[PDB]
């Protein structure tokens, strides 16, 4: 009944939509239209307290706009997703954190770094690299696979805990 607005961001193809659909509907999407941006609702019990997650699965191209800022400003907590087999998506994380800090006008914005696709046998972005960056920013790092569900509940529940600390 308490509602939290979560926003999922990250490079094309990292698994923003797969993460969100795995959480909400307990299955893995092979192909979810990369241009569909929408919010999906899911009720969960975290540390014994029921809440409603209202999760904005972002899409878009690479445009800046104040309009997009308004959508982004609705968020209370942000999942910043890269894929462990996509160096460029890891490189893009700093941009996402900078813009979210700007929109939220705060340096402590509830946020989790998510390294998705951890089911894959070869990573180009090592655990050490991601963990170092998360530690610099003062946010948790959680490895996930939207495919197997490994870490998925942990990533979203951690973000909720981060929000609850923030309030
Ligand atoms: C976070 C954020 C914000 F918080 C507030 C905002 N207001 N307006 C946009 C925006 C964004 C935003 C988003 C919003 C989450 C929807 C997605 C992407 C984005 N993506 C969305 C999907 C995956 C990927 C391509 N398709 N990619 C890039 O690429 C960057 C371009 C500049 O060079 C470095 C990389 N920027 C994005 C972006 O910032 C735009 C930008 C912002 C400021 C300056 C230049 C470019
Ligand atoms: N192996 C693997 N593939 C994944 C994982 N998450 C997403 N994918 C795939 O990566 C592609 C992009 O996922 P999608 O969620 O649409 O990415 P988005 O552009 O970030 O919304 C799809 O083919 C997904 O099935 C994961 O954890 N493991
Ligand atoms: Mg998507």
From Swiss-Prot:
Recorded consequence of changing residue 34 to L: In NS3; characterized by a defective GTPase-activating protein sensitivity and a strongly reduced interaction with effectors
Transmembrane region positions? Answer: none
- Where is the PTM N-acetylthreonine found along the chain? 2
Q: How is it modified after translation?
A: Acetylation at Lys-104 prevents interaction with guanine nucleotide exchange factors (GEFs). Lysine-depalmitoylation by SIRT2 promotes its localization to endomembranes in endocytic pathways.
What is the associated disease? Leukemia, acute myelogenous: A subtype of acute leukemia, a cancer of the white blood cells. AML is a malignant disease of bone marrow characterized by maturational arrest of hematopoietic precursors at an early stage of development. Clonal expansion of myeloid blasts occurs in bone marrow, blood, and other tissue. Myelogenous leukemias develop from changes in cells that normally produce neutrophils, basophils, eosinophils and monocytes.
Q: Can you state the subunit structure given in the record?
A: Interacts with PHLPP. Interacts (active GTP-bound form preferentially) with RGS14. Interacts (when farnesylated) with PDE6D; this promotes dissociation from the cell membrane. Interacts with SOS1. Interacts (when farnesylated) with GPR31. Interacts with RAP1GDS1. Interacts (active GTP-bound form) with both SHOC2 and PP1c (all isoforms) to form a tertiary complex; SHOC2 and PP1c preferably bind M-Ras/MRAS, but they also bind K-Ras/KRAS, N-Ras/NRAS and H-Ras/HRAS. Interacts (GTP-bound form) with MAPKAP1/SIN1; inhibiting K-Ras/KRAS activity.
Q: What is this protein called?
A: GTPase KRas
Q: What is the lineage of its organism?
A: Eukaryota, Metazoa, Chordata, Craniata, Vertebrata
